[PDB]
Coordinates of C-alpha atoms and ligand atoms in Angstrom, one line a residue:
Chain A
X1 CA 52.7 39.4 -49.2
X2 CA 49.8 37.8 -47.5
X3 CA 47.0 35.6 -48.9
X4 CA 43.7 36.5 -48.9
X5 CA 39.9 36.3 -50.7
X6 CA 41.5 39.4 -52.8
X7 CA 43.6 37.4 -54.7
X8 CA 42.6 34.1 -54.4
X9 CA 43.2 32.3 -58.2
X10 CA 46.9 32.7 -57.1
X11 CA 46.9 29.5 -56.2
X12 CA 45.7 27.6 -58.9
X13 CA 47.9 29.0 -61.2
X14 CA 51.1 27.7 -62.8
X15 CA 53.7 29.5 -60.4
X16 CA 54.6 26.1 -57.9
X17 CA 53.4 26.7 -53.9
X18 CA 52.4 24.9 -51.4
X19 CA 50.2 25.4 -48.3
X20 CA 51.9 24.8 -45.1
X21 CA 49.9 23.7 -42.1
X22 CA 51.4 23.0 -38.6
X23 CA 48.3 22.6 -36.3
X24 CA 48.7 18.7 -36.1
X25 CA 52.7 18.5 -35.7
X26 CA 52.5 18.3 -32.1
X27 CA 49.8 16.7 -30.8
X28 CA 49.3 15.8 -26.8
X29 CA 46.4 14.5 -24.4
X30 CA 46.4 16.2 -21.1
X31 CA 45.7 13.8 -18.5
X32 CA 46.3 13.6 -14.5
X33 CA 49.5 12.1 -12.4
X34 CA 48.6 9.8 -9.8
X35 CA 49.4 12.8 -7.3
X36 CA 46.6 14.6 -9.0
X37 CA 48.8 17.0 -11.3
X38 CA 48.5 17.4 -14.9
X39 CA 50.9 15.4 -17.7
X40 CA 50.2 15.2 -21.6
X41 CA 51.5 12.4 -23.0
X42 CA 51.7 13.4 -26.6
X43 CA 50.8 10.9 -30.0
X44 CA 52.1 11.1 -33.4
X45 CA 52.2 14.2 -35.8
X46 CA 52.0 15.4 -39.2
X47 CA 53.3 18.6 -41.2
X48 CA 50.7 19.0 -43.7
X49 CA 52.5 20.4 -47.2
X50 CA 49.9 20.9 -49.7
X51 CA 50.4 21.7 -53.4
X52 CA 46.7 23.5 -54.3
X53 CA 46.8 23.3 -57.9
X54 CA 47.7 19.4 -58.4
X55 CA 47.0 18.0 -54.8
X56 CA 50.1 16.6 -54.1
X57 CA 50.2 16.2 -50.1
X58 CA 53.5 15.8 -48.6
X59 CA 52.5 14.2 -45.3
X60 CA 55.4 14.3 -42.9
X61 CA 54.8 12.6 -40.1
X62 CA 56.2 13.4 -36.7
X63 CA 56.9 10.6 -34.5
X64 CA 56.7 10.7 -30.3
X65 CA 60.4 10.2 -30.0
X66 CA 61.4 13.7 -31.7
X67 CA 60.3 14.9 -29.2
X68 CA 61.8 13.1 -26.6
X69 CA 64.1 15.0 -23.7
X70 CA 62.9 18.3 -25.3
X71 CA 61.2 21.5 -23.6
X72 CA 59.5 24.3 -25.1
X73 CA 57.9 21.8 -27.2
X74 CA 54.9 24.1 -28.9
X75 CA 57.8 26.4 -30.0
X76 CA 60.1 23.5 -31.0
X77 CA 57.4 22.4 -33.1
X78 CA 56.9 25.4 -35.1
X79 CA 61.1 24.9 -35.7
X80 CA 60.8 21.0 -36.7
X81 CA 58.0 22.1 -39.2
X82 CA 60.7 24.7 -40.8
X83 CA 63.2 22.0 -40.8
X84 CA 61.2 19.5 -42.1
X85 CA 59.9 21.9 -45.1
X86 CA 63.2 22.6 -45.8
X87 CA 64.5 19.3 -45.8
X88 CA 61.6 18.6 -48.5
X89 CA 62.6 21.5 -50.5
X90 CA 65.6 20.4 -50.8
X91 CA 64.9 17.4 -52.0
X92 CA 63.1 18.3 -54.7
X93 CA 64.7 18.4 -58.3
X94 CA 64.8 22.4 -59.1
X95 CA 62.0 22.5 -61.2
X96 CA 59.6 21.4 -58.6
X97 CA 60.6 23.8 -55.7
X98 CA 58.2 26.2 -54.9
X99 CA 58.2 29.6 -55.3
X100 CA 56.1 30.4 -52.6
X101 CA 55.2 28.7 -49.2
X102 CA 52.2 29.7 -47.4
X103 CA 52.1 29.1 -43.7
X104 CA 48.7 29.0 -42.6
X105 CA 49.6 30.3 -39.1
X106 CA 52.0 33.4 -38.6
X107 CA 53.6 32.1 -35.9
X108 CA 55.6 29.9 -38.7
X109 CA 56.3 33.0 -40.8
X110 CA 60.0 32.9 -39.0
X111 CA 61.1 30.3 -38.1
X112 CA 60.7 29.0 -41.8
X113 CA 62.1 32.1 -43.4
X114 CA 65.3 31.5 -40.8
X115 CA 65.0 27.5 -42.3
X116 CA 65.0 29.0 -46.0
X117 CA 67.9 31.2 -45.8
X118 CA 69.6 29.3 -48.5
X119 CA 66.3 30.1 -50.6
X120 CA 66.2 33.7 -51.0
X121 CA 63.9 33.4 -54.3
X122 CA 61.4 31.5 -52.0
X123 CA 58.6 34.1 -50.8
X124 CA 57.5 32.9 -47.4
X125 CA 53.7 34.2 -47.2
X126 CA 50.9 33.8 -44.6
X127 CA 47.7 34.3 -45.2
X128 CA 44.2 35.9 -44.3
X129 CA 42.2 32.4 -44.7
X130 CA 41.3 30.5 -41.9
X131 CA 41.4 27.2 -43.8
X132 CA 40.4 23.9 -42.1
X133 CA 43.2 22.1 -42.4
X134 CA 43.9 21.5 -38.7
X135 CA 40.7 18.7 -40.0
X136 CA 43.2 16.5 -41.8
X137 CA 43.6 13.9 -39.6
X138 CA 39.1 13.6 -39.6
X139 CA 40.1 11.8 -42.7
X140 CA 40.7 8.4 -42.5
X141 CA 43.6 7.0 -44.2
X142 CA 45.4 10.2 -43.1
X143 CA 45.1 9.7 -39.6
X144 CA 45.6 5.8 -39.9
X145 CA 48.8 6.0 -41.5
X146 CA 50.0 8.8 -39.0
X147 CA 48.6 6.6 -35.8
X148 CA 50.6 3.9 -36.8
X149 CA 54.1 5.2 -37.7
X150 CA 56.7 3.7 -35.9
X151 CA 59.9 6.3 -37.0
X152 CA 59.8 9.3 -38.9
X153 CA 58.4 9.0 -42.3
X154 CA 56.6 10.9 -45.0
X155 CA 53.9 9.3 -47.3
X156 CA 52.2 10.7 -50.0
X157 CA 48.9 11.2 -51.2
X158 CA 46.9 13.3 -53.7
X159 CA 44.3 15.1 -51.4
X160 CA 41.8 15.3 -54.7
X161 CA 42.1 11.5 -55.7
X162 CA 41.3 11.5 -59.0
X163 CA 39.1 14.8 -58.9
X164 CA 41.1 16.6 -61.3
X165 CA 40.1 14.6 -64.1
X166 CA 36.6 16.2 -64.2
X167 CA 37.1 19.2 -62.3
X168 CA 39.3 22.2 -62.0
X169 CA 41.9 22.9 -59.5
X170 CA 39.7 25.9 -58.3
X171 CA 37.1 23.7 -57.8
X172 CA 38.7 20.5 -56.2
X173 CA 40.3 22.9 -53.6
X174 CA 36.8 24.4 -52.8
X175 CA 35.6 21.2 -52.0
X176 CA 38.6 19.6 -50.4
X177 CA 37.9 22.9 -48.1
X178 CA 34.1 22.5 -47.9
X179 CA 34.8 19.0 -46.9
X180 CA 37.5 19.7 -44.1
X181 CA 35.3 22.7 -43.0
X182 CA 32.4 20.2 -42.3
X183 CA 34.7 17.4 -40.7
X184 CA 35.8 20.5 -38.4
X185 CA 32.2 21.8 -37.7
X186 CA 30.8 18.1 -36.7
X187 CA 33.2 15.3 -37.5
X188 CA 30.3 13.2 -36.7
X189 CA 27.7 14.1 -38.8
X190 CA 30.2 14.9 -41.9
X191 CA 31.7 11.5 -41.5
X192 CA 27.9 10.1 -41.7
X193 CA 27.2 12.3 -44.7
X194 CA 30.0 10.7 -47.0
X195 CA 29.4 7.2 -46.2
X196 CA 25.4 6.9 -45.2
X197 CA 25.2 5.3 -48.7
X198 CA 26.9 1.5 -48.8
X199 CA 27.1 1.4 -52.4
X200 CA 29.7 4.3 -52.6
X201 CA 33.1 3.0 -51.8
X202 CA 36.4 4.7 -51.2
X203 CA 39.1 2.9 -53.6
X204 CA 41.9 1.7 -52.2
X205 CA 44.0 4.4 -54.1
X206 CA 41.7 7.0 -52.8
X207 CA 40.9 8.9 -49.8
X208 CA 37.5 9.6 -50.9
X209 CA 34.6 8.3 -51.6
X210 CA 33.6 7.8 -55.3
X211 CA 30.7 9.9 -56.3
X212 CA 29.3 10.7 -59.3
X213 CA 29.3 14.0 -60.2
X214 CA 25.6 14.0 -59.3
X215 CA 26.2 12.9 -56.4
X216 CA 29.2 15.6 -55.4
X217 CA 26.6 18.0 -56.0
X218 CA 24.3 16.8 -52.9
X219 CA 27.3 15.9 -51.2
X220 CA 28.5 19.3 -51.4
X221 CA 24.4 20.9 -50.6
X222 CA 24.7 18.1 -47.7
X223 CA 28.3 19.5 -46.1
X224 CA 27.0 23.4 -46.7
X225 CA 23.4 22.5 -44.8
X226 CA 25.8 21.1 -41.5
X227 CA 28.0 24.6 -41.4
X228 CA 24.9 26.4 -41.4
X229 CA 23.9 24.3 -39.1
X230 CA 26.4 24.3 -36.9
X231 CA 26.3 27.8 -36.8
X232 CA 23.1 28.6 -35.7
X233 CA 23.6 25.8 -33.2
X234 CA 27.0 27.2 -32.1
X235 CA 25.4 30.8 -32.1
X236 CA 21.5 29.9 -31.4
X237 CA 20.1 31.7 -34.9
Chain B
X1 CA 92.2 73.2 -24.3
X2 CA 91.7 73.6 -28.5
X3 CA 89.9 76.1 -29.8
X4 CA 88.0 75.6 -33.4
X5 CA 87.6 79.5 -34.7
X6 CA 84.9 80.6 -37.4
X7 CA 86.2 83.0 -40.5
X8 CA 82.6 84.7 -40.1
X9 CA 78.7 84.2 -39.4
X10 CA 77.0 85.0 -42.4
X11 CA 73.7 83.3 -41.9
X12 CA 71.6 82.6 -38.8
X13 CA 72.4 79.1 -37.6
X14 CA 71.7 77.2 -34.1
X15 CA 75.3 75.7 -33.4
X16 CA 75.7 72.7 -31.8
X17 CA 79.2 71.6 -29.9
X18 CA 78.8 68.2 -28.1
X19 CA 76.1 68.3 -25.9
X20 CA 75.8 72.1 -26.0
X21 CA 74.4 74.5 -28.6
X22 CA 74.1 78.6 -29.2
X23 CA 72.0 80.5 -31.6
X24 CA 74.3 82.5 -33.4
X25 CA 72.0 85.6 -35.6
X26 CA 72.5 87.0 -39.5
X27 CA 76.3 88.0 -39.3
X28 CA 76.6 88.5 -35.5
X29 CA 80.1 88.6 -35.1
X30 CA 81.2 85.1 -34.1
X31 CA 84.1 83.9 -34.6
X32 CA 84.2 80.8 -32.8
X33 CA 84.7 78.2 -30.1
X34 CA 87.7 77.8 -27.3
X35 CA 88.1 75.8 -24.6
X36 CA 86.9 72.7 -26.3
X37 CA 88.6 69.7 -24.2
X38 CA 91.2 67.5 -25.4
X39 CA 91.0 64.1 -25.2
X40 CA 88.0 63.2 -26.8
X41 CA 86.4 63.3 -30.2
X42 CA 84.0 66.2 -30.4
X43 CA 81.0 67.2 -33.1
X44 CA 79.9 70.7 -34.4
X45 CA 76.8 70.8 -35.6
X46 CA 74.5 73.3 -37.8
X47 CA 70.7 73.5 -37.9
X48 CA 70.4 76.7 -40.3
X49 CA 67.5 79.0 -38.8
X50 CA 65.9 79.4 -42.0
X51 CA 66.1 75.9 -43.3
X52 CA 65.7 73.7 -40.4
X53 CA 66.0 70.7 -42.9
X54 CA 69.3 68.9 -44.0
X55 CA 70.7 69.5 -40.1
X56 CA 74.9 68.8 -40.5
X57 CA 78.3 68.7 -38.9
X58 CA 81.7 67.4 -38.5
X59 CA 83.1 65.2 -36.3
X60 CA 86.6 66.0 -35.4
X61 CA 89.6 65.2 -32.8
X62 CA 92.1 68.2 -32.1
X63 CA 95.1 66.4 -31.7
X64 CA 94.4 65.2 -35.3
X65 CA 95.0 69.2 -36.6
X66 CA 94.1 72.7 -36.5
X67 CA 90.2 72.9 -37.9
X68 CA 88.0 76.2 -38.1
X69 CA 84.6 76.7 -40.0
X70 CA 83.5 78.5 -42.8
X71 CA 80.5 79.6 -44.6
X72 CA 80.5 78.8 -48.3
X73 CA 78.1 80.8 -49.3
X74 CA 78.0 78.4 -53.2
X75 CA 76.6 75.6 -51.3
X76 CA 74.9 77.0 -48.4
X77 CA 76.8 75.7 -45.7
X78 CA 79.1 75.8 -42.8
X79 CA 82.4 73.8 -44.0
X80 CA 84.9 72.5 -41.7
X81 CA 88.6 73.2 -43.0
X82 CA 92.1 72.0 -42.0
X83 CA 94.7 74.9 -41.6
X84 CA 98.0 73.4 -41.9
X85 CA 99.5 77.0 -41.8
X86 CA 100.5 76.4 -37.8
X87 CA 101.5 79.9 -36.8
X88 CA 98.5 81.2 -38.8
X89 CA 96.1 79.6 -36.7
X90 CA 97.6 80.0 -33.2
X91 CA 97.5 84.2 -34.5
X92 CA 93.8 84.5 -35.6
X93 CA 93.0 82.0 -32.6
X94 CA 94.9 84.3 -30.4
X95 CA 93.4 87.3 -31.9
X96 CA 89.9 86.0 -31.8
X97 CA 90.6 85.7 -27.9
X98 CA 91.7 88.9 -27.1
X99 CA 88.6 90.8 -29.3
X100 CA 87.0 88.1 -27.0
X101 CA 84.5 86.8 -30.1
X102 CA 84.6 83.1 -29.2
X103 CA 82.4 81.1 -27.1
X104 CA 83.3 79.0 -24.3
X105 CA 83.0 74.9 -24.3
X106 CA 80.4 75.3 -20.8
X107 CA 82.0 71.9 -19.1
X108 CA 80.9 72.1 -15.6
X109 CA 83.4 70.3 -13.9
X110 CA 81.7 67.9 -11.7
X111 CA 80.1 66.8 -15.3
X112 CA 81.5 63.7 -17.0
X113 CA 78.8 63.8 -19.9
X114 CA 80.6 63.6 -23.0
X115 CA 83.2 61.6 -22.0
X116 CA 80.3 59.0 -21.2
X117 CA 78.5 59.3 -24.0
X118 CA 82.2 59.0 -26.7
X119 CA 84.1 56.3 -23.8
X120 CA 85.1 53.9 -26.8
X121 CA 84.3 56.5 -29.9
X122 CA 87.5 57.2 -32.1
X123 CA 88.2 59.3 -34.6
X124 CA 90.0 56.1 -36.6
X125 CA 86.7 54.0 -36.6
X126 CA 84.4 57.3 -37.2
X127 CA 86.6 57.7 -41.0
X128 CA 85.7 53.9 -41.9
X129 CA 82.3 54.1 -40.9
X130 CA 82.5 57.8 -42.8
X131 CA 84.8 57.2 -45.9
X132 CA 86.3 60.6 -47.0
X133 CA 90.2 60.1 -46.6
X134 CA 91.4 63.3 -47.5
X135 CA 89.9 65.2 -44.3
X136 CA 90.8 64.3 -40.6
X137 CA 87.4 65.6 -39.6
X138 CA 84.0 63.9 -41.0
X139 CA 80.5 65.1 -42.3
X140 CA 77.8 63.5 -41.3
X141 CA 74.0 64.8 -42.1
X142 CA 70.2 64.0 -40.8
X143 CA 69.8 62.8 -44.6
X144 CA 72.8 60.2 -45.0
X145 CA 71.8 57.1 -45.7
X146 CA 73.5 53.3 -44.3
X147 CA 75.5 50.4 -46.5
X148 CA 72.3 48.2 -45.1
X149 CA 69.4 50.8 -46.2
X150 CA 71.3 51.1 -49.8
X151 CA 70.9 47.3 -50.2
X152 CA 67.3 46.6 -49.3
X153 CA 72.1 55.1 -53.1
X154 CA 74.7 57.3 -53.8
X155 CA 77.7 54.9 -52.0
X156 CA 80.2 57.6 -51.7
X157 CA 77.9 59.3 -48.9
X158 CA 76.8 56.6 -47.5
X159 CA 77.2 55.4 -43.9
X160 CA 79.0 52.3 -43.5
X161 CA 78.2 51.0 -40.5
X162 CA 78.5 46.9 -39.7
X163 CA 76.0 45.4 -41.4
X164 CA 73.6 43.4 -38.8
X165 CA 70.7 41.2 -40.0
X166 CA 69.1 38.4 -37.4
X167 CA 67.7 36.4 -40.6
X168 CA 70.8 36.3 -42.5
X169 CA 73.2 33.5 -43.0
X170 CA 75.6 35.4 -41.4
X171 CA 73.6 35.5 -38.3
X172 CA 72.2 31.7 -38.0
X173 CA 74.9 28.3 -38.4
X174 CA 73.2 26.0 -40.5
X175 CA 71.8 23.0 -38.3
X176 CA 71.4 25.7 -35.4
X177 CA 68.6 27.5 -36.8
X178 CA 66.6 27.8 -34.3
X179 CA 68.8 28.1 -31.5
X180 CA 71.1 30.9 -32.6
X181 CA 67.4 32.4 -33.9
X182 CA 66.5 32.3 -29.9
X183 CA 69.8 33.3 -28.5
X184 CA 72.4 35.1 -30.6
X185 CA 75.4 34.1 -28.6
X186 CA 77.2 32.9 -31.4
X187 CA 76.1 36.0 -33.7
X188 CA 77.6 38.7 -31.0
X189 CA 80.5 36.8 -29.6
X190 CA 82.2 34.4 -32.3
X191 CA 80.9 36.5 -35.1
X192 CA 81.2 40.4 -34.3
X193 CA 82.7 40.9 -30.9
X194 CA 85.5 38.0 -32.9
X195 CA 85.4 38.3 -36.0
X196 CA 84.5 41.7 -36.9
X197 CA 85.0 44.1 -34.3
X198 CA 87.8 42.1 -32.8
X199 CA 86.8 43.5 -29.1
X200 CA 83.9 44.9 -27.2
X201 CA 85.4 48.5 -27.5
X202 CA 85.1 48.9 -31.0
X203 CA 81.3 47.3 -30.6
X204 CA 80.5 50.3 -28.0
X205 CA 82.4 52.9 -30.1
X206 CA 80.5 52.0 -33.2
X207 CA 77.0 52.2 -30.9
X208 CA 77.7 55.0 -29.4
X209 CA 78.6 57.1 -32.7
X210 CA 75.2 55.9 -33.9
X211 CA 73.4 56.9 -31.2
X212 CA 75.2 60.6 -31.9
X213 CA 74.5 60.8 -35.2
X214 CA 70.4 59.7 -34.3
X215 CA 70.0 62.4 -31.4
X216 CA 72.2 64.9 -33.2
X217 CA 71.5 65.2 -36.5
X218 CA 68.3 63.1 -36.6
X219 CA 69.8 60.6 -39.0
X220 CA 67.7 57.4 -39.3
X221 CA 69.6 55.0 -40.5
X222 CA 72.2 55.8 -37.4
X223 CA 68.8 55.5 -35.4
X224 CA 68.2 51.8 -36.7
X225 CA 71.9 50.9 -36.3
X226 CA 72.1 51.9 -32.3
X227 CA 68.6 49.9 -31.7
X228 CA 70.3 46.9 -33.7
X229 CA 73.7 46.6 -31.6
X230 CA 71.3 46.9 -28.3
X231 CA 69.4 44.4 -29.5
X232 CA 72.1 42.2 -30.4
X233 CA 73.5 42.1 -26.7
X234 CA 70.1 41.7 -25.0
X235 CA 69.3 38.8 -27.3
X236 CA 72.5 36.9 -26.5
X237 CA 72.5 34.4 -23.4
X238 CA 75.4 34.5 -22.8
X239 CA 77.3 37.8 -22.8
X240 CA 80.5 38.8 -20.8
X241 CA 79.9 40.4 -17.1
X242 CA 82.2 43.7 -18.2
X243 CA 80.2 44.0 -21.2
X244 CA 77.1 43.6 -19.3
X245 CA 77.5 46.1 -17.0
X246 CA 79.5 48.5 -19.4
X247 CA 76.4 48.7 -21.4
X248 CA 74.1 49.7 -18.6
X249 CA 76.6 53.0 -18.1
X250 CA 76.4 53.3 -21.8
X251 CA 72.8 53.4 -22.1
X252 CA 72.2 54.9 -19.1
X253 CA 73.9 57.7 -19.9
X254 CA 72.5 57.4 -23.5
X255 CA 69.0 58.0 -22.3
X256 CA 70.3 60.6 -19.9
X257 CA 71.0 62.6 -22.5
X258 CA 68.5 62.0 -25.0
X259 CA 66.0 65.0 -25.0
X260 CA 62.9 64.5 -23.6
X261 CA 60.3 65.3 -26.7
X262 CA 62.3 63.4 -28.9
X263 CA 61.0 59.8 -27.2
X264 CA 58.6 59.7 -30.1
X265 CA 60.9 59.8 -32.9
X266 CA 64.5 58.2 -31.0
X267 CA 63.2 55.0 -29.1
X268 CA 62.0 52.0 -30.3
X269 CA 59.0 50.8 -28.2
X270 CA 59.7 46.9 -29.3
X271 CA 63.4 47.0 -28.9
X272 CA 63.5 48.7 -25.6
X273 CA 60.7 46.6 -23.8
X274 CA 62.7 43.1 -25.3
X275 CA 65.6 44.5 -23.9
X276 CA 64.3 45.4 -20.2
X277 CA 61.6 43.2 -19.6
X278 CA 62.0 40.2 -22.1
X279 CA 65.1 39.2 -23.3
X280 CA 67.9 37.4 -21.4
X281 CA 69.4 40.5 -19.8
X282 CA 66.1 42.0 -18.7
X283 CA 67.8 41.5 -15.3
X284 CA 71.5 43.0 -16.4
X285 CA 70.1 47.0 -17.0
X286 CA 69.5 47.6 -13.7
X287 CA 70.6 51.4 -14.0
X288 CA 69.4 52.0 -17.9
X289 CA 65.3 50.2 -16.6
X290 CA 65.7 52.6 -13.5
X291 CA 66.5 55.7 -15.9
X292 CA 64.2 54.4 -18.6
X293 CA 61.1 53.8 -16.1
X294 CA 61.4 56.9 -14.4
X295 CA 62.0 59.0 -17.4
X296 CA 59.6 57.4 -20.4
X297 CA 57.5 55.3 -18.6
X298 CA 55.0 55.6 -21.5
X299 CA 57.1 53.9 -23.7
X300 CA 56.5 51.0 -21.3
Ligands
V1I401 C1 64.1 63.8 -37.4 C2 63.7 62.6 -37.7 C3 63.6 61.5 -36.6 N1 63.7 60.2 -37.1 C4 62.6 59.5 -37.3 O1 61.9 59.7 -38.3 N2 62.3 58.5 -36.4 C5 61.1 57.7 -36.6 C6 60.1 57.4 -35.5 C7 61.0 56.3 -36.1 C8 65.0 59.5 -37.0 C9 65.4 58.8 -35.8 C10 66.1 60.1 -36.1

């Protein structure tokens, strides 16, 4: 069924899924007509595909001319995501399709399960969390390679660089979401947080800087501090 | 006019003969119905008085045979038989008459009712949908369950209705996901009103025998199944004007009908209000919204 704080080691364990986000396939800025009405004019996408447990990202990027000539485009969106996830599905040998895909919004719940009919096996779940992936494209790289996509593509990266190595899944996902949560609370003073120090670098493999584990540990206290923060500023406490 | 006679009453039962329905008490003497119109199908139905649950009946056509009722008192019920003796049945009919023990089919005349509620219901497409070939006449109970509840279990009893499913393959063309998802055109016209049902009629018998079975015998699964074909229409762009406007009569007369404390448990809030005030024929019901607004307006 759904996906919640209940059972929340689901995902870390060895049963194949991937997250689903959709909040950055269609992306517009709203600006005024010379006869003072409203147009957006709308910039690249992604579909943000996210396997928890190894951090394979599938980043499919969604380029302007998709949606070119098209109307209802917020609701064709949520249908290009579907297609687009089962495209990728499809491509994968057998024993890397998932067994579950979680949408993180419920509005996807259909027009995925209508995209996965030849899947029957495939539980299509949403979930509970309000997860901060909408904050992908506050990282760099990420947004770089999505800003200057000329056709459709997808590239992929491994959200937890080389994390995994020292840490466990449960833990590289609970700071990939501590990071995104603090790149969604204050992009500014997140961004400031993870490179104030010159000497840490982000490798050209990487998305991330390259901390010691030391210095993920007042990384993290840093990136906790701003969404407290932020939420007494937000809420004046 | 066809008469259906009863051998005997032996337990207090509400009958039910179309639209109409009698409380008949512990071996009153009863010993039937006349007057019962020809040319349509027609349903007898039982609600016991001391076991309101399992409510049942028979669905029958007289032009199909000679049917009367009897209690078996072994399995507790009111059994619809076939007399094949002719001049047998015409004599206890026509002694039944004269002792004057039968009750009338009340058709007021001006009243065109039944007719309006069975227009494309016949007797041929009620045994497929209720398989028992060696009676003319079919059961049907509040309990039966549908082909479609069995899947998601006794199959012999089993209401086979067409199976309709808006996430199934059958439903969507691969590469049109989303628009056949959005508007079911191709679902209702190239798939059931084409393939399957082969014309609108057959679609409207099948609905309105669902709809029967639902306000009759309080059968859910026949409930589900009349929601579904609604929904089918309502949800397709692009439907045929005569089917259109056929359906308004249907439903129209549908709601007409349907008794008035039963909203709760017969209507489906989120079908009905996609149907009138959503979906692409939210302009087409003209006569069904007037009926349905002035009559459950709480349901909206
Ligand atoms: C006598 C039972 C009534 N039914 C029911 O439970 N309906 C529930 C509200 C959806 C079936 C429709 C006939």
């Amino acid at each position: 069924g759904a996906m919640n704080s209940s059972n929340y080691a689901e995902l870390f364990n060895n049963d194949i899924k991937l997250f689903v986000d959709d909040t950055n396939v269609y992306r517009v800025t709203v600006h005024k007509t010379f006869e003072g009405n409203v147009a957006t004019k709308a910039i690249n996408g992604c579909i943000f595909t996210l396997n928890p447990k190894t951090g394979h990202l599938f980043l499919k990027i969604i380029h302007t001319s998709v949606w070119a000539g098209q109307k209802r485009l917020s609701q064709l969106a949520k249908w290009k995501t579907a297609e687009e996830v089962s495209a990728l599905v499809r491509s994968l040998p057998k024993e890397e399709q998932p067994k579950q895909i979680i949408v993180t919004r419920k509005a996807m719940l259909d027009p995925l399960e209508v995209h996965m009919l030849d899947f029957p096996n495939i539980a299509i779940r949403p979930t509970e969390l309000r997860l901060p992936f909408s904050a992908a494209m506050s990282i760099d790289k990420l947004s770089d390679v999505v800003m200057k996509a000329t056709e459709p593509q997808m590239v992929l990266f491994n959200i937890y660089d080389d994390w995994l190595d020292r840490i466990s899944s449960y833990t590289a996902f609970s700071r990939l979401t501590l990071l995104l949560r603090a790149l969604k609370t204050n992009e500014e003073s997140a961004k400031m947080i993870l490179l104030s120090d010159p000497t840490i670098t982000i490798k050209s493999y990487h998305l991330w800087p390259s901390f010691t584990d030391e210095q993920w540990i007042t990384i993290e206290s840093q990136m906790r501090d701003l969404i407290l923060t932020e939420y007494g500023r937000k809420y004046n406490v | 006019m066809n008469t259906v006679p009863f051998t005997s009453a032996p337990i207090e039962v509400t009958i039910g003969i179309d639209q109409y329905s009698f409380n008949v008490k512990e071996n009153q003497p009863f010993h039937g119905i006349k007057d019962i119109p020809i040319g349509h199908v027609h349903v007898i139905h039982f609600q016991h008085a001391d076991n309101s649950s399992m409510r049942y009946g028979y669905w029958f056509d007289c032009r199909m045979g000679n049917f009367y009722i009897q209690y078996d008192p072994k399995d507790g019920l009111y059994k619809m038989m076939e007399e094949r003796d002719g001049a047998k049945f015409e004599n206890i009919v026509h002694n039944f008459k004269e002792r004057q023990m039968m009750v009338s089919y009340p058709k007021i005349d001006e009243d065109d009712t039944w007719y309006n509620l069975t227009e494309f219901v016949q007797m041929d497409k009620i045994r497929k949908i209720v398989r028992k070939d060696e009676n003319q006449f079919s059961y049907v109970d509040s309990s039966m369950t549908t082909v479609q509840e069995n899947e998601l279990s006794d199959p012999a009893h089993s209401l086979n209705y067409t199976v309709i499913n808006f996430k199934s393959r059958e439903a969507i063309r691969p590469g049109h996901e989303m628009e056949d998802f959005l508007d079911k055109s191709y679902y209702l016209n190239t798939v059931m009103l084409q393939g399957i049902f082969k014309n609108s009629s057959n679609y409207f018998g099948e609905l309105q025998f669902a709809f029967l079975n639902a306000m009759f015998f309080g059968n859910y699964g026949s409930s589900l199944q009349w929601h579904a074909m609604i929904e089918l229409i309502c949800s397709s762009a692009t439907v045929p004007k005569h089917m259109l406007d056929k359906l308004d009569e249907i439903l129209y007369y549908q709601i007409k009908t349907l008794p008035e404390q039963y909203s709760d448990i017969l209507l489906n809030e989120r079908v009905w209000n996609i149907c009138l005030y959503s979906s692409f024929q939210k302009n087409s019901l003209h006569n069904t919204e007037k009926i349905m607004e002035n009559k459950y307006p709480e349901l909206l």
